[PDB]
Amino acid sequence: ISKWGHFYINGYNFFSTFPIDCISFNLTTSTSGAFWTIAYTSYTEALVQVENTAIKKVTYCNSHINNIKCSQLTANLQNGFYPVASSEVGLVNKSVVLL
Amino acid sequence: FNNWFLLTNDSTFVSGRFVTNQPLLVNCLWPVPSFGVAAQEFCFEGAQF
Amino acid sequence: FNNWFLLTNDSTFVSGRFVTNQPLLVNCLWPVPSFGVAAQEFCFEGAQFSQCNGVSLNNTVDVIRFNLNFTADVQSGMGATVFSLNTTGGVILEISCYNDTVRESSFYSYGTDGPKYCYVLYNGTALKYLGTLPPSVKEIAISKWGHFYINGYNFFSTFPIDCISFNLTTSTSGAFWTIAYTSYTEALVQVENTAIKKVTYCNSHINNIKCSQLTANLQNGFYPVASSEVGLVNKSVVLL
Amino acid sequence: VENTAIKKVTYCNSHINNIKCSQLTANLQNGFYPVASSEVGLVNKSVVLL
Amino acid sequence: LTFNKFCLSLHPVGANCKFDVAARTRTNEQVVRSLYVIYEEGDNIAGVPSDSVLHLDSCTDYNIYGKTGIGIIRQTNSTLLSGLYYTSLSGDLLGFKNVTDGVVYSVTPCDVSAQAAVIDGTIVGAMTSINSELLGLTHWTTTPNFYYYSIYNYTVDCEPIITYSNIGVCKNGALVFINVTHSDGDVQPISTGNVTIPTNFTISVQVEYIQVYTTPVSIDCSRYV
Amino acid sequence: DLLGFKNVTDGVVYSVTPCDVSAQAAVIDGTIVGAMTSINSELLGLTHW
Amino acid sequence: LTFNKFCLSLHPVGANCKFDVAARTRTNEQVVRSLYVIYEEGDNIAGVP
Amino acid sequence: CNGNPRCNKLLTQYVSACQTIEQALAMGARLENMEVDSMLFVSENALKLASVEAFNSTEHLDPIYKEWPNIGGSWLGGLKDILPSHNSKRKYRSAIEDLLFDKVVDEDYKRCTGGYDIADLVCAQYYNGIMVLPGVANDDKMTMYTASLAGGITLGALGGGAVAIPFAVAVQARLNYVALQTDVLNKNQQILANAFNQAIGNITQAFGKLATVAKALAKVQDVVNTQGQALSHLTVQLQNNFQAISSSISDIYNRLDPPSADAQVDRLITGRLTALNAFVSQTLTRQAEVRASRQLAKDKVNECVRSQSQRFGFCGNGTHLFSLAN
Amino acid sequence: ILANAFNQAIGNITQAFGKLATVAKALAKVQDVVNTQG
Amino acid sequence: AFVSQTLTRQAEVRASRQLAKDKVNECVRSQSQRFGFCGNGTHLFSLAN
Ligand SMILES: *[C@@H]1O[C@H](CO)[C@@H](O[C@@H]2O[C@H](CO)[C@@H](O[C@@H]3O[C@H](CO[C@H]4O[C@H](CO)[C@@H](O)[C@H](O)[C@@H]4O)[C@@H](O)[C@H](O[C@H]4O[C@H](CO)[C@@H](O)[C@H](O)[C@@H]4O)[C@@H]3O)[C@H](O)[C@H]2NC(C)=O)[C@H](O)[C@H]1NC(C)=O
Ligand SMILES: *[C@@H]1O[C@H](CO)[C@@H](O[C@@H]2O[C@H](CO)[C@@H](O[C@@H]3O[C@H](CO[C@H]4O[C@H](CO)[C@@H](O)[C@H](O)[C@@H]4O)[C@@H](O)[C@H](O[C@H]4O[C@H](CO)[C@@H](O)[C@H](O)[C@@H]4O)[C@@H]3O)[C@H](O)[C@H]2NC(C)=O)[C@H](O)[C@H]1NC(C)=O
Ligand SMILES: *[C@@H]1O[C@H](CO)[C@@H](O[C@@H]2O[C@H](CO)[C@@H](O[C@@H]3O[C@H](CO[C@H]4O[C@H](CO)[C@@H](O)[C@H](O)[C@@H]4O)[C@@H](O)[C@H](O[C@H]4O[C@H](CO)[C@@H](O)[C@H](O)[C@@H]4O)[C@@H]3O)[C@H](O)[C@H]2NC(C)=O)[C@H](O)[C@H]1NC(C)=O
Ligand SMILES: *[C@@H]1O[C@H](CO)[C@@H](O[C@@H]2O[C@H](CO)[C@@H](O[C@@H]3O[C@H](CO)[C@@H](O)[C@H](O)[C@@H]3O)[C@H](O)[C@H]2NC(C)=O)[C@H](O)[C@H]1NC(C)=O
Ligand SMILES: *[C@@H]1O[C@H](CO)[C@@H](O[C@@H]2O[C@H](CO)[C@@H](O[C@@H]3O[C@H](CO)[C@@H](O)[C@H](O)[C@@H]3O)[C@H](O)[C@H]2NC(C)=O)[C@H](O)[C@H]1NC(C)=O
Ligand SMILES: *[C@@H]1O[C@H](CO)[C@@H](O[C@@H]2O[C@H](CO)[C@@H](O[C@@H]3O[C@H](CO)[C@@H](O)[C@H](O)[C@@H]3O)[C@H](O)[C@H]2NC(C)=O)[C@H](O)[C@H]1NC(C)=O
Ligand SMILES: *[C@@H]1O[C@H](CO)[C@@H](O[C@@H]2O[C@H](CO)[C@@H](O[C@@H]3O[C@H](CO)[C@@H](O)[C@H](O)[C@@H]3O)[C@H](O)[C@H]2NC(C)=O)[C@H](O)[C@H]1NC(C)=O
Ligand SMILES: *[C@@H]1O[C@H](CO)[C@@H](O[C@@H]2O[C@H](CO)[C@@H](O)[C@H](O)[C@H]2NC(C)=O)[C@H](O)[C@H]1NC(C)=O
Ligand SMILES: *[C@@H]1O[C@H](CO)[C@@H](O[C@@H]2O[C@H](CO)[C@@H](O)[C@H](O)[C@H]2NC(C)=O)[C@H](O)[C@H]1NC(C)=O
Ligand SMILES: *[C@@H]1O[C@H](CO)[C@@H](O[C@@H]2O[C@H](CO)[C@@H](O)[C@H](O)[C@H]2NC(C)=O)[C@H](O)[C@H]1NC(C)=O
Ligand SMILES: *[C@@H]1O[C@H](CO)[C@@H](O[C@@H]2O[C@H](CO)[C@@H](O)[C@H](O)[C@H]2NC(C)=O)[C@H](O)[C@H]1NC(C)=O
Ligand SMILES: *[C@@H]1O[C@H](CO)[C@@H](O[C@@H]2O[C@H](CO)[C@@H](O)[C@H](O)[C@H]2NC(C)=O)[C@H](O)[C@H]1NC(C)=O
Ligand SMILES: *[C@@H]1O[C@H](CO)[C@@H](O[C@@H]2O[C@H](CO)[C@@H](O)[C@H](O)[C@H]2NC(C)=O)[C@H](O)[C@H]1NC(C)=O
Ligand SMILES: CCCCCC/C=C\CCCCCCCC(=O)O
Ligand SMILES: CCCCCC/C=C\CCCCCCCC(=O)O
Ligand SMILES: CCCCCC/C=C\CCCCCCCC(=O)O
Ligand SMILES: *[C@@H]1O[C@H](CO)[C@@H](O)[C@H](O)[C@H]1NC(C)=O
Ligand SMILES: *[C@@H]1O[C@H](CO)[C@@H](O)[C@H](O)[C@H]1NC(C)=O
Ligand SMILES: *[C@@H]1O[C@H](CO)[C@@H](O)[C@H](O)[C@H]1NC(C)=O
Ligand SMILES: *[C@@H]1O[C@H](CO)[C@@H](O)[C@H](O)[C@H]1NC(C)=O
Ligand SMILES: *[C@@H]1O[C@H](CO)[C@@H](O)[C@H](O)[C@H]1NC(C)=O
């Protein structure tokens, strides 16, 4: 469930509602005695390998080597030279010149 | 990734490698044990539980 | 294909082979013999007549083609009118040629040897001027949608024609000519000097391959084809 | 132009100068070049209609 | 057709597009008015011919989850735990899932490409992936990669007129397998023991074509443009 | 491009040709010494032919 | 942004382009009016924050 | 056109381009097939001698070679990785060939129309009108060709059965061709055989997991990748809208009246024809390059494997002795 | 014998050219070259 | 595009011309010692048309 109102069941968005400020639940497994999980997650960029509509491997582009891996679409980089950027530009001053 | 899927608004990929923006930065993980009850009014303002 | 031409709305090909949809499915062929008169009020509803040479189809007729030399020996038994047209809404149009020029929205004053000026008449008055009769007319094709082709070129069009009347003869020339009731079909046509030389109908699998390859003499080899055609099929709808 | 300064100007005022301007060089190498046989100026007008 | 929002109006304000209202006479059609449309993409609202049918094992016109086409739909034993429908690299629908029970269905084209063999201006055989009659051919045989239909009486030793790789087709329509060329072998530079030396020679002539030059073209760029 | 047409009155055929055509000029030592052309007319300041 | 001429109008006559005036609610945005712009390229007039 | 009859009727005015595209592809394939067919050949006796088991036995040796235990002899340790063996998945396959075809790398189209599962990439391409002609027969012919070339070296005679000679005798003949040997008593082929065995073992180790080996691996991987990418691009070109509402002809015909639908479909037709023309041009260029490479390979086979060339530095860097092919 | 074989081979080649895998390959190659040029 | 295609063809024909020159020099004007170069078999002489 996304805070923008979208519901995904097994990965597919079947229905959407108005944006949700806050949501309530109260679930249990009764007497089955089964443990399960709840995940509070955020969006991030990653390389995902899928086999038969199932996730097999996830590589996060969180480091320079991981950035190269994501750029090359492979988790096993062969030895060699790869083009990269020397740095990123962030907060910068503004200069205006007019006649 | 047994109960984890790639979210999509359209047809789903069967096989291959893709660079995508997915909800995968796990802010928190709550394991509900056997014979346990998970009840919460969670508002989207943080998950430091 | 001596008095047969490829119909066109534009410039005409001089030489080469082209796959085109042309009025070439001959529903009926009427040979007018020497010293004979061909008179008919043909309405476009079939051409199963007793004078058809061979076997006549039951399909509807698309185009009617007159194959004859339109020389000075050609005479009409309806006077100056060569073709009487009945269009939608009961509007009568006549194609009439005279020996003298007729003013617009006027009628012939004197009512054989010389230039002939042809006009379209609606209520006995000249509506459109078509021009003089050229000395080399070999075929006149008329479609039920109102288009007229002279030697393959569409010179004028009228309202859609429900049914058309004529009454022609070759006088004392003693020349036989032809009338063809034909329908549109796809075929490969070879043209040399704006003249039809060979026609291949795509009516069989081998003919389909020939039309696809733009040649009537296929070399031995393998060619890609479709395994079948899809016709009438059920419809399936799935929704959430 | 060299360093935003004019160094050489060649006017396309002759046939050889026209070829030089077409080839973007003032020193043509020996060879064959495509050209036009003439220019069309004031001409009559002809209209043909049905 | 499916939409999330659909509205008709007589005013142009906020309209994504407009229709053309026209009057048709016996010989002419004249536009008189305009009808404006405000629409949003989605699937909440669907237009129907009048106020869920699935045909299986037969060619049909399908409209499944907004994807339309012609094909044959078959139930499968496959299990795919993620998604609703699946598409190919070119965007064609390959399969979908029934939401009620999770059963997977596959979609295949009704007609496929085939290879027709033409010898002496007639069709003698056809290679196809579907075991069905085509091109007026009735008899057929099975090969490890395809079905082969032929005018040859199938329930052969002949010269292949048309060959590709190991496959050859005879004028009677029969299918033959072509093997690699055989030769006696090469004479070895051995001078020990029993050896063979070629003695009786005839003459063979072999033809080889080689291209030497092209046909150059000069282009007047100004005259072409 | 239009190549020819016919006069409807008498059936006479007329042909249309371009007024100017492409030519090949020979340049030796920065001057024009000759020209190859399909029209027998003077061009590029050349008289003898 | 620099222009040689910039005019806003409520009439479509002579306008190069138009803006879309809309009302934004808590869940929807609806276009109500149009504001037409007549502009010319240049640098005589410049918009500033 | 994805099987749409109206799209086919529209394309009937463009049949010439499809005719040009199809003829260019069928003639290129035919020419390549006729030069490959002319290139390859086998010999029956050489194939009967070309195996590890035959080289490890003495059933084919002439009675005069009683001293030698088998055909391979001291060289067999290097020849077991090159000669075909019975412990292979396919016939006439060697260890190096299997290693190459596994490290670097179905043709049945009857399974695509079965509908027993979701179609894979090859079947999906076939649904789009793209067929890959069979190539397994070419690989089998090539492996038989190389096996026959290897086995012909030890064939003592051509007019009868499979009579064999020891490999050391052939090596000695090659040495005499290089230079007339004058020390018959002090033959030292053991050093050469040991060096050959060690080199072959190191090459096999490199292929399983030496600049020439790396260059060859890079070249074959590049060839495979280039072959795949062109078809991938051609398939992916079918998703382009070409300034139309949709890339699906069926959707266009289901959403629009025929007069507007035809105008929408014409743009897709033109774009797809342009893509096919580009693919054909690239294919023809590749085919010409591979024709030149095939001429080079034929020269190498004729002058380094079937004979001992007198050209300096043609069969490798050094004084050439013999060459084998896989 | 060599002269007779040469004469027969040349005659067969001429017959093939007027209306033998090498001859077919050469004809296909030259036709392909002409068509590609056009 | 036409120029690019023409240049590629010209390079291919240059390679073919080199092959033809080698064939003329080694099979027609002399008797080559290269095995299997002037056809399949023991070469005797070659003619050209
Ligand atoms: C299926 O389709 C639906 C519908 O299109 C998609 O839903 C969209 O989901 C995305 C996130 O994946 C939503 O994007 C977010 O929009 C929020 C609203 O943005 C407004 O406000 C910001 C400033 O606050 C403006 O810049 C912007 O123009 C809008 O006016 C934003 O608040 C979010 O931004 C913040 O969060 C992201 C992280 O999520 C940060 O990167 C940003 O910097 C910022 O902090 C965010 O961008 C989008 O609104 C949804 N659309 C709708 C219509 O609801 C589904 O994603 C799609 N599903 C799949 C699987 O593809
Ligand atoms: C020179 O230019 C003129 C003017 O454009 C062309 O004249 C057209 O000729 C074609 C035939 O060649 C005419 O096409 C026909 O239209 C008829 C009217 O169609 C309407 O009704 C049908 C349903 O009944 C609707 O589907 C359609 O949208 C229209 O509303 C149709 O009745 C005809 O269809 C039937 O006949 C054909 C065989 O002819 C069958 O294939 C069909 O299945 C069907 O049974 C037919 O399609 C067209 O109307 C003419 N246009 C005009 C404006 O009059 C000339 O053809 C052209 N000349 C040359 C040489 O190119
Ligand atoms: C390069 O050029 C060489 C020659 O310089 C070619 O090699 C020749 O290839 C041919 C074709 O394969 C060989 O001829 C074949 O011999 C087989 C065995 O021959 C028997 O009969 C003769 C009778 O005189 C005996 O001398 C001989 O010992 C054998 O007992 C035949 O079986 C072959 O017959 C074919 O035709 C009949 C008729 O239909 C069929 O039934 C057979 O199955 C078969 O198809 C054929 O006669 C010839 O021996 C080879 N000569 C040499 C010197 O090696 C190469 O092929 C060529 N290379 C390339 C790549 O083209
Ligand atoms: C939720 O459903 C999933 C299936 O989607 C259940 O997972 C399955 O659990 C069974 C029983 O433990 C597993 O069976 C085992 O199979 C292996 C073969 O790989 C075998 O070696 C074991 O001995 C055993 O038979 C099954 O594999 C497993 N499937 C997957 C994909 O993990 C899961 O148990 C269900 N959870 C609950 C709480 O019911
Ligand atoms: C209608 O006009 C056509 C011409 O467009 C007439 O056809 C022509 O008829 C003449 C006289 O029969 C033919 O002349 C013959 O020419 C051949 C040479 O090929 C010669 O061998 C014969 O001895 C004779 O001189 C002429 O070829 C022929 N032209 C064509 C194209 O067929 C036709 O006769 C006219 N019909 C009527 C009824 O007037
Ligand atoms: C790759 O090549 C290297 C040499 O470049 C091979 O290593 C060499 O192996 C031989 C034996 O095969 C060693 O020679 C000696 O052999 C006798 C055999 O009786 C033994 O008694 C001696 O103790 C000694 O091992 C030689 O020293 C050795 N050379 C080096 C530099 O290590 C290697 O085996 C080859 N690899 C493969 C996988 O074939
Ligand atoms: C194509 O080649 C074939 C052979 O592969 C040629 O047929 C052969 O023709 C010769 C004569 O040229 C026949 O030999 C004999 O010639 C003497 C001449 O005096 C004659 O008295 C004998 O009765 C006999 O004809 C030979 O048998 C024959 N071979 C075959 C298999 O038919 C053929 O002529 C060549 N074609 C051309 C157009 O050159
Ligand atoms: C075609 O025209 C001829 C010639 O005008 C018509 O023949 C006339 O027929 C009427 C009776 O209908 C007779 O009184 C006339 O004497 C005939 N004239 C001649 C010259 O013979 C003929 O009837 C017309 N055909 C049709 C079907 O109307
Ligand atoms: C032109 O065709 C129209 C077609 O309608 C003819 O009008 C019909 O004439 C018949 C004669 O039996 C009447 O029964 C119908 O009621 C008429 N229909 C209409 C709609 O008026 C008309 O007569 C034809 N014109 C000529 C001169 O023959
Ligand atoms: C999906 O599967 C369900 C069953 O799991 C199908 O529902 C059946 O539909 C038929 C035809 O209307 C009914 O006779 C049955 O009673 C239904 N079975 C149920 C509800 O359990 C449904 O048709 C399938 N959907 C498809 C094929 O699109
Ligand atoms: C080479 O072949 C010859 C025959 O051409 C062989 O000589 C024959 O050998 C057999 C088997 O021992 C004897 O029965 C014959 O009497 C021999 N014939 C003659 C004329 O001597 C010879 O043995 C073969 N040589 C080799 C090395 O195999
Ligand atoms: C087509 O040819 C006719 C003659 O067949 C030309 O008509 C002539 O025009 C000139 C100039 O006006 C008159 O002096 C003649 O008397 C006309 N001759 C006739 C009517 O027989 C006509 O000009 C030609 N059309 C062109 C050249 O476009
Ligand atoms: C093509 O020729 C090869 C080589 O002669 C044939 O291979 C033979 O196959 C049979 C059957 O398995 C074996 O018993 C022989 O030993 C093989 N011969 C050799 C020399 O290895 C092959 O069968 C032929 N293929 C066809 C389809 O006829
Ligand atoms: C700022 C760049 C200066 C020049 C850097 C030169 C060296 C590094 C890049 C080498 C590229 C090698 C290309 C071949 C592929 C490979 O072997 O990796
Ligand atoms: C469903 C198809 C299965 C595979 C069919 C293979 C055989 C038939 C086609 C051969 C193509 C030959 C291409 C070269 C040109 C030619 O010689 O005709
Ligand atoms: C009207 C043109 C008739 C033909 C003219 C032929 C001769 C002149 C042009 C020669 C072109 C040479 C091209 C190669 C480049 C060069 O050497 O200049
Ligand atoms: C902008 O400039 C100021 C000084 O004018 C400097 O202190 C500051 O770091 C600059 N900000 C940047 C470069 O982001
Ligand atoms: C449609 O399905 C029915 C049964 O529901 C069948 O009888 C009919 O033949 C089908 N029509 C086709 C396949 O055109
Ligand atoms: C136009 O034609 C007239 C004669 O009608 C002629 O004198 C004049 O030179 C022509 N003008 C041109 C060719 O520019
Ligand atoms: C699919 O299921 C059927 C029984 O419904 C069975 O006969 C068939 O073999 C199965 N196929 C596979 C591949 O499991
Ligand atoms: C084909 O062969 C079978 C063999 O049983 C025979 O019965 C049949 O008549 C043959 N058919 C033809 C058309 O010859």
Residue numbers in the entry:
A (entry chain C): 429 to 527
B (entry chain C): 282 to 330
C (entry chain A): 282 to 392, 399 to 527
D (entry chain B): 478 to 527
E (entry chain A): 626 to 676, 684 to 787, 801 to 870
F (entry chain B): 724 to 772
G (entry chain C): 626 to 674
H (entry chain C): 871 to 975, 983 to 1086, 1098 to 1214
Recite the paper's sentences.
FCoV-23 is a recently emerged, highly pathogenic recombinant coronavirus responsible for a widespread outbreak of feline infectious peritonitis. All coronaviruses are decorated with several copies of a homotrimeric spike (S) glycoprotein that is the target of neutralizing antibodies, drives viral entry through receptor binding and membrane fusion and contributes to pathogenesis. FCoV-23 S-long comprises an amino-terminal S1 subunit, folding as five domains designated 0 and A–D, and a C-terminal S2 subunit. Collectively, these findings identify APN as a bona fide entry receptor for FCoV-23, which seems to have broad receptor species tropism, mirroring that of CCoV-HuPn-2018.
To reveal the 3D organization of the infection machinery of FCoV-23, we determined cryogenic electron microscopy (cryo-EM) structures of a prefusion-stabilized S glycoprotein ectodomain trimer construct comprising D0, which we designated ‘S-long’. 3D classification of the cryo-EM data revealed the presence of two distinct S protein conformations: one with a population of trimers with three D0 regions swung out, and the other with a population of trimers with two D0 regions swung out and one D0 region in a proximal conformation. These structures were resolved at 2.3 Å and 2.7 Å, respectively. In both conformations, domain B (the receptor-binding domain (RBD)) adopts a closed state. a,b, Ribbon diagrams of the cryo-EM structures of prefusion FCoV-23 S-long in two distinct conformations defined by the positioning of D0: the ‘swung out’ conformation (a) and the ‘mixed’ structure (b). The overall FCoV-23 S1 subunit architecture is reminiscent of that of the CCoV-HuPn-2018 S1 subunit, with which it can be superimposed with a root mean square deviation (r.m.s.d.) of 0.89 Å over 496 aligned Cα pairs (excluding D0). The FCoV-23 S2 subunit adopts a spring-loaded prefusion conformation and also closely resembles that of CCoV-HuPn-2018, with which it can be superimposed with a r.m.s.d. of 1.3 Å over 453 aligned Cα pairs. The similarity further extended to the conservation of key APN-interacting residues, including FCoV-23 S Y549/Q551 and W592 (corresponding to CCoV-HuPn-2018 residues Y543/Q545 and W586, respectively), and to the conformational masking and glycan shielding of the receptor-binding loops by the N567 oligosaccharide (topological equivalent to the CCoV-HuPn-2018 N561 glycan) from a neighbouring RBD in the closed S protein trimer.
